[PDB]
């Protein structure tokens, strides 16, 4: 299914995910598409910081949902 | 000379640079310190988007100058 | 009641609506106020893409809620 | 506990709060740290405008949540 | 010549233009292709908000240049 | 001379100023009207972030010019 991922300045991309993906899986998909390492990524939905081991379904994130990506800004 | 690079989450770093340094050299220092791939960094100074292939002197970047660093999240 | 509509740049407007208004109603108000064709509008609340046939009530959108507008650069 | 407060431009700060803090108390903490008068503050969580007399725990706002701040201005 | 008009949703609009074309001419093409009235478009090049009656050559917009297009709703 | 100061919420502030007025003078006038401290104000004109100690004339700001005012929270 399609979701959207938005940065702090409003830049928005699409991403293909499944409801059973863990948040860590989603970050890996973001790495495939954009080259951002998963340990540099923080994901947010509806104000809530998302935890790596939980799934999209766990959070009730459905198709065409928008997640927010913020960088963690850690050493290379 | 020392310059400042700021982010929207409030992490500021200093870099030690020369006027002859290229923008791509600055971006490499930023990936080393903050983990952002260079192709995903956008730097703004004096209203301009700083481009690889130019030097700091081309934008009149000087000691104490402050650059604004944001995530590009390029493509769609 | 008043609601707020936020765009990707952060520019925000206010609309006067009713809880029983449909998502398509709201897109028609945006067209009336600003000239944006409804078929070019995606509306989002709390991360969820909102469906045309449903109402603000269905989504628990109360007074002084903030919705997001993103353009569908072509979307029929 | 820590929360994030994001502005219209994307600029984000962290704030130390407690679950039992009222929304008014949180606006006052923002005033202490940033000088913005509480009267000039709207706070939003998952699209909902937060009401001064209720607590963060009433809204189920947990650690590492992101709130949005928008200024209430006059304009003449 | 071609210029590239980029959007916050990552859609790049390629336009066939002449240096003698005005910003109004560019906005008119965007209205026809994407449905956004010119009054609700803002175009950025070199940090400047581009004025309707000025030409591409006046802004030193050359072949293969990139412009940033954002939705600009108007009003409170 | 009159200048106009626009905000992302659509509240436009009209100021009576002189070309020799410094940006810090202007920001104090905005604080008088709206309550936002100067360190929390950024003004954009011609793509530049206007510097406190410089004059309106330094940036070629003249009668009926429009400035963009945005909230700038400080720190991490």
Curated annotation (Swiss-Prot), chains A, B, C, D, E, F:
Cited function: Exists either covalently attached to another protein, or free (unanchored). When covalently bound, it is conjugated to target proteins via an isopeptide bond either as a monomer (monoubiquitin), a polymer linked via different Lys residues of the ubiquitin (polyubiquitin chains) or a linear polymer linked via the initiator Met of the ubiquitin (linear polyubiquitin chains).
Domain Ubiquitin-like residues, every copy: 1-76
Glycyl lysine isopeptide (Lys-Gly) (interchain with G-Cter in ubiquitin) crosslink location in chain: 6, 11, 27, 29, 33, 48, 63
Post-translational modification: Phosphorylated at Ser-65 by PINK1 during mitophagy. Phosphorylated ubiquitin specifically binds and activates parkin (PRKN), triggering mitophagy. Phosphorylation does not affect E1-mediated E2 charging of ubiquitin but affects discharging of E2 enzymes to form polyubiquitin chains. It also affects deubiquitination by deubiquitinase enzymes such as USP30.
Chain positions found as ADP-ribosylglycine: 76
Site (Interacts with activating enzyme): 54, 72
Lineage: Eukaryota, Metazoa, Chordata, Craniata, Vertebrata
Native source species: Bos taurus
Modification sites for Phosphoserine: 65
Coiled coil: none
Name this polypeptide is given: Ubiquitin
Domain of life: Eukaryota
Compartments in which it is found: Cytoplasm; Nucleus
UniProt cross-link Glycyl lysine isopeptide (Gly-Lys) (interchain with K-? in acceptor proteins), position: 76
Residues of the whole record sequence present: 1 to 76 of 156
Site (Essential for function): 68
